[PDB]
């Protein structure tokens, strides 16, 4: 369903994409673009689990 | 509402001498003189100085006020016609049949002679207005240059040439042939 604790890897393997603020903005770019598919993103569609940590849900301030 | 007073300010460049008497405007510039009668409008004129003229309408309704900035624009066009000139460039647009355009002179009059338009055997002739110069552009293929001091005559001759080349009994979205005005500018760039 992913992350599979590797959604940051998809952000850090696609490290050359979103010219955002601090790495975690790159992860949101894949968050936004993968929402256009629609699968088992933690149970539902994105633009929701995205918007949880977008405001601040659990914890991804990875360095 | 009967606006109590409405004003517009003409601007006269350094070498130009406007001259107004009884609503007959005579504009003089380096390029010549142009005259226009405005006896069909109720306007009054005040010379602010040699470079500016106030044009006033007193106690005018909506339409009579609307007729004021058009007076301003006409006199300004006269001014730029005698200080910069006018130049319209026309491009010859055809899909199959080349348009054969010549500047002929018959009976002492200049004419624009369009032949083979859409393959027709008919010969189209457009009278060239006085004060209007025609030239076949050398730098451009299928281009006609219409020039002169008066914008009204130049644009109306250009419109005559464009209008005589209208397409009949066809889908004009498909049969786009004709002679069209491509550039509207001045003699002095």
């Amino acid at each position: 369903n992913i992350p599979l604790d590797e959604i940051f890897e998809i952000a850090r393997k696609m490290q050359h994409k979103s010219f955002g603020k601090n790495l975690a903005s790159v992860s949101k770019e894949i968050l936004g673009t993968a929402q256009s598919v629609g699968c088992r993103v933690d149970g539902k569609n994105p633009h929701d689990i995205i918007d949880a940590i977008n405001a601040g849900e659990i914890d991804v301030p990875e360095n | 509402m009967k606006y109590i007073q409405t004003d517009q300010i003409l601007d006269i460049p350094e070498g130009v001498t406007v001259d107004i008497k009884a609503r007959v405007v005579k504009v003089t510039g380096p390029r010549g003189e142009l005259t226009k009668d405005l006896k069909h409008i109720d306007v009054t004129f005040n010379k602010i100085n040699n470079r500016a003229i106030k044009i006033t309408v007193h106690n005018g309704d909506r339409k009579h006020v609307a007729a004021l900035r058009t007076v301003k624009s006409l006199i300004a066009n006269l001014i730029t016609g005698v200080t910069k000139g006018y130049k319209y460039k026309m491009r010859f647009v055809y899909a199959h049949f080349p348009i054969n355009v010549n500047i002929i002179k018959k009976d002492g009059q200049d004419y624009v002679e369009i032949r083979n338009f859409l393959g027709e055997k008919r010969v189209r002739e457009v009278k060239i207005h006085e004060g209007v110069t025609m030239e076949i552009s050398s730098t451009q293929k299928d281009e006609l240059i219409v020039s002169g001091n008066s914008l009204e005559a130049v644009s109306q001759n250009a419109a005559d040439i464009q209008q005589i080349c209208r397409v009949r009994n066809k889908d004009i979205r498909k049969f786009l042939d004709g002679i069209y005005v491509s550039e509207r500018g001045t003699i002095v760039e």
Binding site: - | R91, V93, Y94, A95, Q162, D171, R173, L176, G178, Y180
Partner: protein, 52 residues
């Protein structure tokens, strides 16, 4: 055949228009009302249809 530069110049005067829905008038594309008195200066306009 007409070059694309000349085909856009032609299309201004032949194609880029609006049409009155009641009396069939060739109007400017930006026009909000028909200029003809016979239809009552209606605002019921629609773009001129294109070849397809």
């Amino acid at each position: 055949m007409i070059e694309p530069s000349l085909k856009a110049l032609a299309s201004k005067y032949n194609c880029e228009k609006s049409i009155c829905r009641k009396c069939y008038a060739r109007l400017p594309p930006r026009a909000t009302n028909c200029r003809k008195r016979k239809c009552g200066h209606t605002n019921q306009l629609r773009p001129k249809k294109k070849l397809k």
